Write a protein that binds this ligand. Structure first.
Ligand SMILES: COc1ccc(CC(=O)O)cc1-c1ccsc1
Ligand SMILES: [Zn+2]
Ligand SMILES: [Zn+2]
Length: 585
């Protein structure tokens, strides 16, 4: 395997020849270990607390989930722990018949996805514009430097020769240039999947790319109208670690639809950075901290450009295979059979495939499936055999589905149908409230001024106004944060990296105006475009639902907090200084 990965290791070895060594106490069992070199410790044992959000959410100072989120270890100790538990495993190879069905389904799926769109290369200017409209950091400085682009051209020339020299995945200025350059090249060859929305619902049927969190609930409610069995939402245990060599070969089939110049570069990403990979991971030792150089031929690199799209692809494929087994199209004998008859698989795909894709909502490893009946609950032979073993359940125990789309978990949320005072219905996203408060209380990094902290707090408050306004405690805390932070201060940083986040809260525009735009004007499931003129007409969950989902409403500590909130707002204001503030209470 050194013929593909050798050059990359050689450059790492030569760059760190001062401290390069083969550690014999290295813990890698399924990854090939190449060597180590000394580094300085990266990450922290805990996370920095947002004092603005914390001062305005006092009742949650005594909440266990809120305290757990304040932790999260990112040190070389924390890295090694998660690695041992998840990453250092081997997925048994699927059976010959399973491999055949997967190949037939992948070919059909790629042709269906490419029926209107044609693959294309992504550019230097697209990558630049994206980096620009994100930070405005060191990534924007590299994009601005012509010497970074000349390193890109040189690595590209190697890729055209079927070689790689610096595309290394990470679990001072030269190494940063090689990392960003590796990501640019991946984006150039596979970025079209994201940039041209191959996984939009109109293009993929099952996909939800570009839809946004506030649209996911409406999609689940539309799926519920399709005749069939229950709605299933099974969680795979560590999806990225279950991506097999057979999955990678099926994913690669997209190169068949590419122009010759694009195919060569995409083939280079697939063969050299997906099907072979060189990975850097930190590790503590009695001597200090080391960086290990490891490699393998399968699994998915979590941080890559193609990750979301290719996980969505393989999960759509895997769920269609499970649907076929549920329908009796695929038997136990079929999966073991190398000479499995292609005809009934092709017939099912050509006659039912698209209708079956419409019964699903698939976002990377997250899936919701409404099969034609409940035989799907016990259709586990292919799912387990493909390596997509469900999390925290015996392997052969039937899946439990839901007969109400409002109970279905999808993308860390569930969704409620609300009735507004004017009789119109809204479908809103929701999750346990402690997870929302616990996240907002976290500031990312260190050395942040009260202004930056207050502005991130404002971002969280405004996200709650737009997505979670239906939670009494979050509307109150949101109003308190926005009252404590100067009106003209622009929310900074980000509340989430989710593909489902459109960041409509990253503004100084009136939140009720933005609310109306999102939930009324631009909402395709809102036939009546009558604007809501007051927050008084913006609904809450029913009190019992709010409580079932974590509200502290009805508690004394909460009644005391609500009563005394103008005092805490005033305290934050007095520390921020002589700025313009608006009272939202
Ligand atoms: C499906 O949308 C999500 C999924 C998870 C998360 C949590 C996180 O990324 O910290 C946030 C969102 C989200 C998206 C728009 S507002 C909040
Ligand atoms: Zn490379
Ligand atoms: Zn809820």
């Amino acid at each position: 395997n050194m013929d593909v990965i050798g050059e990359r290791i050689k450059r790492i070895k030569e760059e760190h020849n001062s401290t390069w060594h083969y550690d014999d106490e290295n813990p890698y069992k399924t990854w090939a270990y190449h060597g180590s070199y000394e580094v300085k410790a990266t990450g922290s044992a805990s996370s920095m607390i947002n004092g603005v959000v914390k001062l305005l959410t006092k009742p949650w100072d005594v909440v266990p989930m809120v305290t757990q989120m304040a932790m999260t270890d990112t040190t070389p100790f924390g890295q090694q722990r998660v690695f041992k538990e998840k990453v250092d495993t081997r997925t048994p190879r699927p059976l010959p018949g399973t491999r055949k069905v997967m190949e037939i389904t992948a070919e059909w799926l790629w042709r269906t996805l490419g029926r209107n769109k044609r693959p294309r290369l992504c550019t230097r200017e697209e990558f630049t514009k994206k980096v620009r409209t994100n930070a405005a950091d060191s990534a924007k400085a590299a994009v601005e430097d012509e010497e970074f682009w000349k390193l890109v051209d040189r690595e590209r020339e190697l890729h055209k020769l079927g070689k790689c020299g610096s595309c290394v995945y990470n679990m001072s200025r030269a190494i940063w240039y090689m990392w960003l350059g590796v990501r640019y090249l991946e984006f150039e060859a596979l970025g079209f999947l994201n940039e041209d929305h191959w996984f939009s619902r109109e293009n993929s049927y099952s996909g939800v790319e570009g839809e946004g969190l506030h649209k996911l609930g409406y999609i689940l409610r539309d799926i519920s109208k399709i005749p069939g069995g229950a709605m299933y939402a099974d969680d795979t245990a560590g999806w990225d670690t279950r991506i097999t060599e057979d999955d990678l070969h099926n994913e690669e089939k997209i190169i068949q639809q590419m122009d010759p110049e694009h195919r060569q570069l995409a083939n280079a990403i697939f063969k050299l950075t997906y099907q072979n990979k060189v990975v850097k991971v930190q590790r503590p030792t009695p001597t200090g901290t080391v960086m290990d150089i490891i490699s393998r031929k399968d699994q998915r690199g979590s941080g890559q450009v193609g990750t979301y799209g290719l996980n969505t692809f393989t999960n759509m494929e895997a769920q269609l295979v499970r649907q076929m087994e549920g329908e009796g199209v695929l038997t136990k004998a079929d999966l073991e059979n190398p000479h499995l008859l292609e005809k009934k698989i092709t017939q099912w795909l050509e006659t039912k495939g698209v209708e079956r894709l419409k019964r699903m909502a698939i976002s990377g490893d997250d899936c919701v499936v409404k099969p034609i009946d409940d035989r799907f609950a016990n259709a586990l032979l292919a799912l387990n055999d493909m390596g997509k073993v469900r999390k925290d359940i015996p392997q052969w125990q039937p899946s439990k589905g839901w007969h109400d789309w409002q109970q279905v978990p999808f993308c860390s949320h569930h969704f409620h149908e609300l009735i507004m005072k004017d009789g119109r219905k809204l479908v809103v996203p929701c999750r346990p409230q402690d997870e929302l408060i616990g996240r907002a209380r976290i500031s990312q990094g260190a050395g942040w001024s009260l202004r930056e902290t207050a502005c991130l707090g404002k971002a969280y408050a405004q996200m709650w106004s737009l997505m979670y306004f239906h939670r009494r405690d979050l509307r109150l805390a949101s109003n308190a944060i926005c009252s404590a932070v100067p009106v003209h201060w622009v929310p900074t940083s980000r509340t989430t990296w989710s593909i489902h986040a459109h960041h409509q809260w990253m503004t100084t525009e009136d939140m009720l105006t933005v609310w109306n735009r999102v939930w009324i004007e631009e909402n395709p499931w809102m036939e009546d475009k009558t604007p809501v003129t007051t927050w008084e007409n913006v609904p809450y969950l029913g009190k019992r639902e709010d409580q079932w989902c974590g509200s502290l409403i009805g508690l004394t500590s909460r009644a005391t907090w609500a009563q005394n909130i103008p005092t805490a707002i005033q305290q934050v204001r007095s520390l921020i200084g002589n700025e313009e503030f608006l009272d939202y209470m």
